[PDB]
């Protein structure tokens, strides 16, 4: 059978890649940072507690001004907060309450959200009338929306439970490109700082690097044992971190094409739900199923801090563009700002 | 100046806050339900008797609002999107009892739902559907349940069982055996957090909307008794 001819040949292509990466792995990140001094103990306190959501929060996203942020809760609400004064700026009621992701446009004029409705809805924040209404409804995913991120006012990338990712032209509402490498549900995506690439993690325990303008999968990363739930780019765009249900976080490098560091502990037996780096990339913050957030020294793989305020599962966390504050959403319906 | 903005922002926040209080009363009054089941289980028939990624059904029993959600355009892998329904009042699980092997597959799905970390406090209203089809398969006698379930040979109808009038004891023994296969999973990890409410149903039973209401009332009662450490 020719199906075995192609299944035994791909095995050799997996052995060739395994040895091509093995040769590049001359040293490990741990020994190169065996001499750098640790960050110490990181103590962050809750500065703001954003209340107003009725049900569990699933996603949040900072604005580019590092002050405004949007949060999505499964009671069917998008709330735009002023993190300084804790004042709500907008409260957008959603058509479908089973929202799983939200996004802030870099211009600050649009927000996006989506979930089990299989639709990415775009809202106009700055209308001439002064209201917030739906600008576009992007349909074309056959599975639930897991993540969405704006490239600009007219382009947004979405990841879906139907195992694909897609790039949308917002004004026309049509998929410009489609990314069909994964075999499991895609759970999260992260745009490179130059917005020319993006990485996505799926439920096949793998992550993939995509060319936005070309539409191809450049690199595929493995190493995790279970579903990848979270993914985030390193500040320089040359690396990214993934959090999985196998209770570990891992760091990958694009140019080395392999995992550099694993952030784990023997007492941690719960999955990671969200990851984000600090402004310099020295800190890797991760939310966990056990209601806590762990601050990881991304260079030494040592745990440096813990944010312990949340009553329930931590769903999301974001770092401001100026690195001043960290937000955390949780299933307890509260958002906490930590400095 | 800066002071004028803080005034105008404080006005917008209070207007949003009054709307949120109104939303809180509407949200806390509706009871959300997840409807699960195979393609041949008959749940789509129970839906109409009472492509988007999810479908909604809003019905009312005794002036109580119920919001039933049916999964539409999703893949058969549920381990991710099923976590969204951890806060529903109950999960309505529909099983085709006459499908003895869809029945073992339904037993396996019930086991993973029952033992899921995020669904541990969610009760399950279990509909053992297609009871009329099960009667025709046992009365005919062409296919023995003992083939796919060899423990049916040594199984006797329990004494607490209440067979319907005009029912062949072979049918009563068959349908109560299937119920016990599910109850063996339910009573192994109950622990008082959640409970399974099994019902022998038919896809056209007009009393199905009442079984959900009566089970949801029992679920909320056990939730209140739990907040006072009474039960």
């Amino acid at each position, epitope marked *: 059978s020719e199906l075995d001819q192609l299944r035994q040949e791909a095995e050799q292509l997996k052995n060739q890649i395994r040895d091509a990466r093995k040769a590049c792995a001359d040293a490990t990140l741990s020994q190169i940072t065996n001499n750098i001094d640790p960050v110490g103990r990181i103590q962050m306190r809750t500065r703001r507690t954003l209340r107003g959501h009725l049900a569990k929060i699933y996603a949040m996203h900072w604005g580019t001004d590092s002050r405004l942020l949007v949060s999505a809760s499964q009671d069917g609400k998008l709330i735009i907060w002023d993190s300084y004064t804790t004042n709500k700026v907008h409260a957008i009621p959603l058509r479908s309450s089973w929202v799983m992701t939200c996004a802030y446009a870099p211009s600050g004029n649009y927000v996006a959200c989506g979930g089990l409705d299989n639709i990415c809805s775009i809202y106009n924040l700055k209308t001439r009338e002064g209201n917030v209404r739906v600008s576009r409804e992007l349909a074309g995913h056959t599975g639930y929306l897991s993540c969405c991120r704006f490239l600009d006012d007219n382009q947004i990338v979405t990841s879906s439970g139907d195992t694909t990712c897609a790039l949308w032209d917002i004004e026309t509402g049509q998929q410009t490109t489609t990314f069909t490498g994964h075999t499991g549900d895609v759970m999260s995506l992260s745009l490179a700082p130059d917005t020319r690439l993006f990485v996505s993690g799926a439920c096949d325990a793998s992550a993939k690097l995509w060319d936005v303008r070309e539409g191809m999968c450049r690199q595929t990363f493995t190493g995790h044992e279970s579903d990848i739930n979270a993914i985030c780019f390193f500040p320089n765009g040359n690396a990214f971190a993934t959090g999985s*249900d196998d209770a570990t976080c891992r760091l990958f490098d694009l140019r080395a094409d392999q995992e550099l560091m694993t952030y784990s502990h023997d007492n941690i037996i719960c999955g990671i739900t969200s990851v984000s780096f600090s402004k310099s990339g020295r800190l890797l913050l991760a939310g966990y199923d056990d209601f806590n957030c762990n601050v990881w020294d991304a260079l030494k793989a040592d745990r440096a801090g813990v944010l312990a305020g949340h009553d329930n599962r931590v769903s999301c966390l974001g770092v401001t563009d100026d690195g001043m504050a960290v937000a955390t959403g949780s299933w307890d319906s509260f958002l906490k700002i930590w400095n | 100046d800066q002071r004028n903005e803080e005034k105008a922002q404080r006005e917008a926040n209070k207007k949003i806050e009054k709307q949120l209080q109104k939303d809180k009363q509407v949200y806390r009054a509706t009871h959300r339900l997840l409807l699960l089941g195979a393609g041949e289980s008959g749940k789509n028939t129970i839906v109409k008797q009472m492509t988007s990624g999810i479908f909604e059904t809003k019905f009312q029993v005794d002036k109580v609002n119920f919001h039933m959600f049916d999964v539409g355009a999703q893949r058969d892998e549920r381990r991710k999107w099923i976590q969204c329904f951890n806060d529903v009042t109950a999960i309505i699980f529909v099983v085709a009892s006459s499908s003895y092997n869809r029945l073992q597959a339904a037993l396996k799905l019930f086991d993973s739902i029952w033992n899921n*970390k995020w669904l541990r406090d969610t009760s399950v209203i279990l509909f053992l559907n297609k009871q009329d089809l099960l009667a025709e398969k046992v009365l005919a006698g062409k296919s023995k349940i003992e083939d796919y379930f060899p423990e049916f040979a040594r199984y006797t109808t329990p004494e607490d069982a209440t067979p319907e009038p005009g029912e062949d004891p072979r049918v009563t023994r068959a349908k109560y055996f299937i119920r016990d296969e599910f109850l063996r999973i339910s009573t192994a990890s109950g622990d008082g957090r959640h409970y399974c409410y099994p019902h022998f149903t038919c896809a056209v039973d007009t009393e199905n909307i009442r079984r959900v209401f009566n089970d949801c009332r029992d679920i909320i009662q056990r939730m209140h008794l739990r907040q006072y450490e009474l039960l």
Partner: nanobody
Amino acid sequence: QVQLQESGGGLVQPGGSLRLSCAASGFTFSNYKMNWVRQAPGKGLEWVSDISQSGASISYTGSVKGRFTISRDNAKNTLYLQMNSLKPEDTAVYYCARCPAPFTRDCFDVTSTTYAYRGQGTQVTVSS
């Protein structure tokens, strides 16, 4: 890289014996529940048997009780399905399926059409 490689199988007579083996790689074997699933010709995937992390709790589909015995050697990272007194209806491709998450009591999606943590399979043929 999670990989499951099923061995054994082939042609056998009714009442014969076949011992299926599943070599695991790329994950801590002991932290995971393991399953056996099969796909008969022209039919869907069916769960056959599973075994807990340590090997104490064991379950079977009724049609193979008294005939098939599942076991695991965590030190050897291997799953086994000893199949005694085979019947012609036991002809199928047998897949060694891993459970998606570690340290869990639930085990979702192991019989899905596109499940990721499943091997390619091995063929078992029981005929005259």
